A paper describes a structure:
To capture the strand passage event or the passing DNA in the large central cavity of the enzyme, we replaced the gapped 43-mer DNA substrate with a DNA bubble, in which the 11-nt ssDNA is opposite to 13 unmatched nucleotides. Additionally, we identified species with two cTOP3B bound to one DNA bubble and obtained a ~ 4.3 Å cryo-EM density map of this cTOP3B dimer from 63,000 particles. Within this complex, one enzyme binds to the 11-nt strand and forms a cleavage complex. The second enzyme binds to the opposite 13-nt strand without cleaving DNA. Remarkably, the second cTOP3B assumes an open-gate conformation with a dsDNA arm trapped in the gap between domains I and III and interacting with domains III and II via charged residues. Interactions between domains III of two TOP3B molecules provide additional stability to this open-gate conformation. While the closed cTOP3B exhibits a planar ring conformation, switching to the open conformation induces a major swing of domains II and III with rotation of domain III over 60° coupled with a ~ 40 Å translation that opens the planar ring. The catalytic tyrosine in domain III disengages from the MnC2+ binding site in domain I, creating a 40 Å gap between them, which may represent the open ssDNA gate of TOP3B in the DNA-cleaved state. This conformational transition also disassembles the hydrophobic core between domains III and IV, leaving only a weak charge interaction between them. In our resolved TOP3B dimer complex, the opening of one TOP3B is possibly driven by binding energy from interactions with both the DNA and the second TOP3B.
Residue numbers in the entry:
A (entry chain A), B (entry chain C): 0 to 611
C (entry chain D), D (entry chain B): 1 to 161
Write the structure that this text describes.
Amino acid sequence: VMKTVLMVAEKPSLAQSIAKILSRGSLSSHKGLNGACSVHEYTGTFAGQPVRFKMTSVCGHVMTLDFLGKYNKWDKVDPAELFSQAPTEKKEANPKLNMVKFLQVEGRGCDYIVLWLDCDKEGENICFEVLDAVLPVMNKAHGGEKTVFRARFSSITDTDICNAMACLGEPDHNEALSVDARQELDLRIGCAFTRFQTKYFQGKYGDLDSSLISFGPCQTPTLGFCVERHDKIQSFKPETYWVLQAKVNTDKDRSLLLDWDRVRVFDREIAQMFLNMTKLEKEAQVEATSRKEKAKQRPLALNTVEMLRVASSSLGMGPQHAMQTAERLYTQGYISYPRTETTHYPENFDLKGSLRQQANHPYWADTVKRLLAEGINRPRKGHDAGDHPPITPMKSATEAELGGDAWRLYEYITRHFIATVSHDCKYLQSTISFRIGPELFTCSGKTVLSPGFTEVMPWQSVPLEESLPTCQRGDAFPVGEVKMLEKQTNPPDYLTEAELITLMEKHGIGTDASIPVHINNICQRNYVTVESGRRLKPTNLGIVLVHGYYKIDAELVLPTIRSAVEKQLNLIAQGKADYRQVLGHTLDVFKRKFHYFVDSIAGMDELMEVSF
Amino acid sequence: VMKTVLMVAEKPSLAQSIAKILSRGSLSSHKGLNGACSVHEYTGTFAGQPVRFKMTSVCGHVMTLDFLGKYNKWDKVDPAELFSQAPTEKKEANPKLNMVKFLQVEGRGCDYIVLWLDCDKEGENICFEVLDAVLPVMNKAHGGEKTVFRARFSSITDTDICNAMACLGEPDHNEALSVDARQELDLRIGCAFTRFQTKYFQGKYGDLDSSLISFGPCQTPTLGFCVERHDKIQSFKPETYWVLQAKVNTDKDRSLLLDWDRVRVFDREIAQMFLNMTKLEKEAQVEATSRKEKAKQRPLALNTVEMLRVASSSLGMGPQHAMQTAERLYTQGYISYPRTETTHYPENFDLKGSLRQQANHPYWADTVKRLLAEGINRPRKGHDAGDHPPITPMKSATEAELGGDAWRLYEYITRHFIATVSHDCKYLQSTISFRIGPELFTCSGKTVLSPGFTEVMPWQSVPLEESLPTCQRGDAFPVGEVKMLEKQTNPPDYLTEAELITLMEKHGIGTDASIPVHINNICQRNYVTVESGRRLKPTNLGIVLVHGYYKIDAELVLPTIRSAVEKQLNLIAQGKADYRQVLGHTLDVFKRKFHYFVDSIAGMDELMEVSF
Amino acid sequence: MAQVAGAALSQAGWYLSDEGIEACTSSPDKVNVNDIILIALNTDLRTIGKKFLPSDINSGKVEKLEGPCVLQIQKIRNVAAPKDNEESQAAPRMLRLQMTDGHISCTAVEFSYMSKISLNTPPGTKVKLSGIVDIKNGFLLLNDSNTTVLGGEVEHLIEKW
Amino acid sequence: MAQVAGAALSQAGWYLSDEGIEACTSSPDKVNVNDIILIALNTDLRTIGKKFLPSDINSGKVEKLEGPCVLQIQKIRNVAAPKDNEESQAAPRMLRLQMTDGHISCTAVEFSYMSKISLNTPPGTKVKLSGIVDIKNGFLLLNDSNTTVLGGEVEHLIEKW
DNA sequence: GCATCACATGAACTCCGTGTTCAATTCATTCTGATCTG
DNA sequence: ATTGGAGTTCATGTGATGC
DNA sequence: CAGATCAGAATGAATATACTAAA
Ligand SMILES: [Mn+2]
């Protein structure tokens, strides 16, 4: 008899593709009763029987077990709650989408149920959570035949899905239970540490009560991987090595040094041997010279953070007095509000008039006058934050108006706003290579051709050097003098967010695409800061937190411990014990260590007495 | 012992204001059992008895009008039966307010009632609704004296409201049942036409799925405005200009460009002959010199329509967003009532006091202090309409408490007010006319003498240009080169939001608060999509549907039916006709139109299929 | 006498064919200058205008016109205004007139401001060009002292359309 | 024995000692040239081989080395990398290799970047020098024309971490 | 066929600063491909 | 024209059932 | 025979029934 069978997935494009493969007639479309991702239907034959194929793809994934118990409360709750005293059940979260209409559609009745969601552990979790809701509302399970059918497609592949259509079956069990068990473990641990950081870490400090410590199973190891580099920097262990130096003779007027293309070597004798091979120079060769063209980019609109950074640099003086000047300036009033977080320059702003009010102070001069003349180019597009328009001067002043450091600051803003409109600084980066012995040394230099914004901010200007005498390949260009040198430094180069990414997959904690959101979480929690050059230097709160961790309880850091718990909750596939013991023994050993951690809040309290 | 008098205001804020003046500081305030509007009680006198006054504020429309729920099933009957076979009732709008139950629970025993709603139209509905709600509530009219009193206050000022409670009146049912008529007629027309259209056009054309087709008294004209604009833009025949240009120098390094009195000629060979007679010369003589001065007009008070216009044009904000931001600023207690029409300031309004409060914001500290010296100039004698006072800032606010849309909309609100009471800008225009052959050429220029409101509103400032050098009769300036120019007739651009307001207010399509809603309505239904520059471009679906009305029956789209229906209902408002019978006459003619539209719809389908 | 009347009309500018003069008249009877002027003014110029222009008018060889002459204007358009906005006042008015003689149509550009003839001028109206006529590039330039429209009625082929 | 033993030895240069031959698996009348090396590719050359290298390689008296020879690796390091970190692109990779024959170890520096030996290779991997090799003072230069990798295990631990 | 009753449910009344993960469509930007000539 | 939100319990519409 | 000169893929902001009108 003409029955009905419903199929569940989660992607609209994948839904369209599977409809296309299922009928090749595009089915027919019903407007999404769920409010999104309209559904399709056909008159097909699943097992050769006449069945209305009604197919849908859910718009998301209901999640958030959370608590489902008011016993969550706040500070006035039993601490044992965060250890084990929590009646745990899942909620129909994010109803801002709906999922009530999803349940209604899954209701009514279907002869058979086909599940085609994501082919992973999370997808199986969604599949089972959908299953335990669709079975209570389906018509009936009459007969010994099963009503659940799962495909085995790997990704978007026509032949793979074609054979997976025949490759039917029942979804494997306990993977969803593994993953959701991992989620409740994250719930309990994070809630526990947040509750007791709100209890003890704030310590009624007044100033630090506003700040929040957002602990997680991976947040602390990520902070540790942000801070250990600073720790090795404090180690400050220097190094020793050698540098080969040589000179290719000029026209007897100028000088032409080289750079030893095999840059740097850590030895005592191999460098001496190379010197032995490079101490009888008689002739050189011009094997290759290169001359490219790359343009330095115009600056952006100034932020409060950038202003503070350059003012601590540049003229150079502390943030507190910088903010003091900011205010006095807003007062005699020469600048807009000094708490900007945008780089948009909204179109309402009168660029022409603003640039027009500066017709004095010969420091900016006929240069800005001709910039007023002809055409001005559009500034760089930035980001809209909705705080207030960026920093910009009004009704410019002179030497005798402000004076001192306030005048210096105003000079900075004035120069930067002049720079905000200009042409890019073009230059030719030339390099010529000299071939001697088993070596192919190379020297490089830059020659500016268009100053542009270089005319307004010398402190950001390309350095001046003599242009290298470009010549044809294979010229003689003999040698002058050669030398063996030494140079060394600190442990350099506090690495950046790219190296954070690399080490983050290296240790192996995180998920497919949540690395940026963890980074954003750990930075808004005021543990690290963003510095120029994409630097990720930590802050006082982060460093004291990691130091307090290390001093007494490194187990909670143990950057391999998260991978260890992950692998022991991955080994729970196949025949094994119950989740109850696995969670309970682990959490109870952590909570005993954590009880005497609370008994030893000392370490952190001395860290506070030291640094706050 | 004492009696009780109940009074309700239309708006909560005006309610507390009335309480402030009435009780002269004897407030007994407490929030009512709704969480929306509080209740203020005090003691006083009324017709010579010491009595107690309780006053509340209905939060808007007490009730709205809708048909029977059965006919709201969208499939019970054909919409034609809606004309004269659909009984219609009134329901309490916004049940979340629970206004009907609030007025039911509060009002028992209130022997006398005085009513303080707005005296214009659209308030009589509310007053009679409140009256009919409260009549079954009080302690019965045992006393032969009537208890229904109406307060007729013209302007919201202290002395005016003093006279208001000095002398009261009685409402006007005859003109109440005119706005009643207009509301019901609009309701039936919409609920018939829109329903029939959305049922038909989506019947077979599948692309019209998941969309709503609308028709009515205001939506159709506000679409047709942009439609006619697009039709004129498309139907255009480009042509070419011919202008002669003259170039001269005065002494050295000075370039002057002359202008032809005959600004353009539409013929190639005639322009060539004009050039032929012109080029054979080398000298130019001054004939007429001018030293005439003019003045620029300072703006009126910021009306609601003008505020919306400037917010759209300069700030790049949609009308709905602007209205919402204004409402937020109003409810936070910064600026006084957003939706107002009156222009003239109250005579007894303390203009000086408002300017005094806003004197510490650095952006104006120099200009506000100077203006306070010579005394505020009298405001322009504009127009009055008996509505609420115009928009003005009420108390100072630095940027700290304000954000984005804040220093945006609020910044214009204040700058408009300082300019309102400021002086005017004095500028000098000098025109010098030269003789080139038999023809006449002249140059025009302007200069600043003493800026007025231009020192507070930068965008409305006189442009700066080089002043013409002084000239004396009888000199022959050296003549440079000439050059004829070929130009083209620029077609009109897409309609801007500012021009739509002109086309709205002048024809009176909507009310003060209806304009932002309708513009949002037409944009939301995918009829017209906004683009860069806040211009409105009609969609393909919009263009095809509207054109059919033009060729079928223009009596449903021309921007005059709204004026006609409004002008034909005021006769009922003055009681010059019969209320019952006029509605039938209006219903009867529209009934014929609905049948014709059904009959004359086939041709529109032919127009529809061209697009799809 | 006949040649005396012809010379009088020549001094008035009027140049007509003989066949024109006995065609315009209601009868070959005693005639006076006023009646012959009015009766020819009633008639169309196409059949009554003799060869009184020296030709070569379109080209630039011609340079000026002396003496009293008689012409007509057939169509008038404002070359100083666009076509879509036919009644725009963005510029001072400056017309061009299609001036005919019964043999050729030339262009007379209005060089001086004038009000006694407007855009809605009855077409085919009679004009006199006594004295000085400035023909610059073969095209005529109007003036307020020589170019004088005398009025007239002709069979209205235009009906404004 | 005799000629066939000499030919088998000289074919690969794996100059195994008599004691190593008798200690390892060399079954008489089972194989002569093939399986001996086939199983020797995983045998301790350090203990089974003789010092066919000169007496004073590190002294510098010997200049040039010729003939195909096969040796093991003991300590291979990038001479242009710090002690803490060994893998980076901050400088061209110059490999320093402690190169073992069995009695007299030596060390070779790699000139040409070769993608056959990594910094993680297990010690004892067979490397065959084939051609002319030059030592400067106490270190021998390498090139792709000289070194050929074969692979093997020295029967040791991981000697790491 | 009809009066009844208990159950679901919507609404009126009253009392009281958590990890993880996405997340369902198509901008203007931003870092990857074809072609004469010293 | 533009307002606090959550849990409880009670009145009511209605579907299921018995007479 | 690839700079100077014009063209594609990754990055990344985007929303969806209820009817009209109007406080
Ligand atoms: Mn109102």
